[PDB]
Design a protein around this ligand. Structure first.
Ligand SMILES: Nc1ncnc2c1ncn2[C@@H]1O[C@H](CSCC[C@H](N)C(=O)O)[C@@H](O)[C@H]1O
Ligand SMILES: [Zn+2]
Ligand SMILES: [Zn+2]
Ligand SMILES: [Zn+2]
Length: 424
C-alpha cells in the first residue's frame, strides 16, 4: 500500500509528492541500492558488504582486493563482485575511482534483468544527466573517466556488444555525479556510495521535510515534520554546516542549479555561523582541508595532532558557535573516541551540544547521533544523571529519524536501561 507519487515539477524535470497525510517519523520508502561500493577512504577498513568497522577481514582469494567481515558476507556480495573481481586483480595496486567501480556495478546489474526494487519508481535511464547544462572542466572531467573506465573494464568489456544498447558511457557518468548518495554508518561516518533510482526523485531543500538514514547499505526514507497531502517531498543534499554561499557553490558545481530554499535566499543563520574574527577562521578553514583527508582514510592519531593545536591555539578568542571552530571540535572528538582518550572526547563533544541544537533544527539524524555519542560517553564516564538526559533526548530525536526499523534504536534502548540500572 503506497504513500507517494512521481510527477513533473514546476520547471525541474520530475519530483516526488505525498498522497496521504504524513505525520513526523513516518516510514515512507525503504530501498536497497541498485549498485554500491565502499568508497576509497573506508576501503580495506570496512566490509565490501555489510560495511562495518571490524576485526579480521578476509580478502577475496582471487582478486586479493575486496575485504569481507564474514564468510556469509563474501557469499552474499559475490553476485556483484563476480565480474569486477577480475579487473581489480589487473589494477593491483592501482585502484580505480569510486564513480568508476560503481558504474561497473550498474552495468552488470542492468545486464542480468532483475526488476530491481530500487527502481520501482524511476529507472536508471530516467535519471537526470544534465548534459546540456554542464560546464567544460566538468565535461572534460567526464571524458577522463570514460577512458579510465574502459582501460579498467578491459577484462570484461571489449565493446558495446556487451553493453545494453541505447546506453552511452559519457552520459551514464553524468547521471552518476548528480544522482549518487553518500552512505554512512551508525556513527554517521561516510563509508561508501550508491545509486538509489527511486530516491533520486526527491528534490533539494536546505530546510526539507524528509530525511535519509542508512542501516548498513540499506536506506530508510522517513518524514521529519507534519506533511499535508499533495506537497512535494524534499531532503537536503548537503551537510548542514555550510553557509548560503558554500551551498550555492557546490549545487552549481555538482547539480547545476541555484537554490530556492527560503534559507538560501535570506542568508539564514549565516551571521551566527561566522560569528567571530575572519582572520582567525580564514586560516582555520584552510587547515581543515588537510585534516579531513586524514579522516576519511582513518588516520586518527594524525588528525588529533593537528586538531588539539588549533583549539588550544584559539582558546582565548574564537567561540564554539562558529562552524569552523565547531568542525574541529567535532573532529577532535571522533579522534579521541577512536583513540580511547574518552575523558578528552567528552570534554570536547559536550561543547558541541549547544551549537548543534541550533544548527540542526527539528529532528535531524546527525544531531541525534551526536547526542547519543555524547550521552554514551557520559554513561561510560559514570555521569548517569546527565547521561539519562541526553540518551532520552537522543531517543526522542531518533525515534523520528531512524524508527524501530533501524537497528541502532535497539542498541539505544539497551543503553537507556543500562544507565537506569546505575541509578537503580
Ligand atoms: N531543489 C532543486 N532545484 C532545482 N533543480 C533541482 C532540485 N533538485 C534536483 N534538481 C535537478 O533536477 C534535475 C533532474 S530531473 C530528474 C531527477 C531529479 N532529481 C528530479 O528533480 O526529478 C537535475 O538537474 C537536478 O539537479
Ligand atoms: Zn575478488
Ligand atoms: Zn560484512
Ligand atoms: Zn537553499
Amino acid at each position: 500500500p503506497l504513500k507517494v507519487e512521481k510527477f513533473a515539477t514546476a520547471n525541474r524535470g520530475n519530483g516526488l509528492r505525498a498522497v496521504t497525510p504524513l505525520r513526523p517519523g513516518e516510514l515512507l520508502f525503504r530501498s536497497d541500492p541498485l549498485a554500491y561500493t565502499v568508497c576509497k577512504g573506508s576501503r580495506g577498513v570496512v566490509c565490501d558488504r555489510c560495511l562495518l568497522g571490524k576485526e579480521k577481514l578476509m580478502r577475496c582469494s582471487q582478486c586479493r582486493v575486496a575485504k569481507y567481515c564474514s564468510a556469509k558476507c563474501q557469499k552474499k556480495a559475490w553476485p556483484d563482485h563476480k565480474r569486477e573481481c577480475k579487473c581489480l586483480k589487473s589494477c593491483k595496486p592501482r585502484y580505480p575511482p569510486d564513480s568508476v567501480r560503481l558504474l561497473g556495478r550498474v552495468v552488470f546489474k542492468l545486464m542480468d534483468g532483475a526488476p530491481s526494487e530500487s527502481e520501482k519508481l524511476y529507472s536508471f535511464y530516467d535519471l537526470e544527466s544534465n548534459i546540456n547544462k554542464l560546464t567544460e572542466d566538468r565535461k572534460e572531467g567526464l571524458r577522463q573517466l570514460v577512458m579510465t573506465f574502459q582501460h579498467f573494464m578491459r577484462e570484461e568489456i571489449q565493446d558495446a556488444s556487451q553493453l545494453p544498447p541505447a546506453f552511452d558511457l559519457f552520459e551514464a557518468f553524468a547521471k552518476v555525479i548528480c544522482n549518487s548518495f553518500t552512505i554512512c554508518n551508525a556513527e554517521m561516518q561516510e563509508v561508501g556510495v550508491g545509486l538509489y533510482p527511486s530516491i533520486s526523485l526527491l528534490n533539494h531543500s536546505c530546510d526539507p521535510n524528509c530525511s535519509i538514514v542508512f542501516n548498513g547499505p540499506h536506506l530508510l526514507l522517513r518524514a521529519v515534520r507534519d506533511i499535508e497531502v499533495g506537497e512535494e517531498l524534499t531532503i537536503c543534499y548537503l551537510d548542514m554546516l555550510m553557509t548560503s554561499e558554500e551551498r550555492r557553490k557546490q549545487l552549481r558545481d555538482q547539480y547545476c542549479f541555484e537554490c530556492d530554499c527560503f534559507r538560501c535566499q535570506t542568508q539564514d543563520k549565516d551571521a551566527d555561523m561566522l560569528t567571530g574574527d575572519e582572520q582567525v577562521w580564514k586560516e582555520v578553514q584552510e587547515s581543515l582541508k588537510k585534516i579531513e583527508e586524514l579522516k576519511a582514510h582513518w588516520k586518527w592519531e594524525q588528525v588529533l595532532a593537528m586538531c588539539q593545536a588549533i583549539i588550544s591555539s584559539n582558546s582565548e578568542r574564537l567561540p564554539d558557535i562558529n562552524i569552523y571552530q565547531l568542525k574541529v571540535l567535532d573532529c577532535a572528538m571522533d579522534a579521541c573516541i577512536n583513540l580511547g582518550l574518552l575523558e578528552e572526547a567528552l570534554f570536547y563533544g559536550t561543547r558541541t551540544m549547544e551549537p548543534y541544537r541550533i544548527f540542526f533544527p527539528g529532528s535531524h539524524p546527525v544531531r541525534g547521533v551526536q547526542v547519543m555519542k555524547v550521552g554514551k560517553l557520559q554513561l561510560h564516564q559514570g555521569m548517569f544523571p546527565q547521561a539519562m538526559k541526553n540518551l532520552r533526548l537522543a531517543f526522542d530525536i531518533m525515534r523520528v529519524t531512524h524508527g524501530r526499523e533501524h537497528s541502532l534504536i535497539e542498541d539505544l534502548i539497551l543503553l537507556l536501561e543500562e544507565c537506569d540500572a546505575n541509578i537503580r
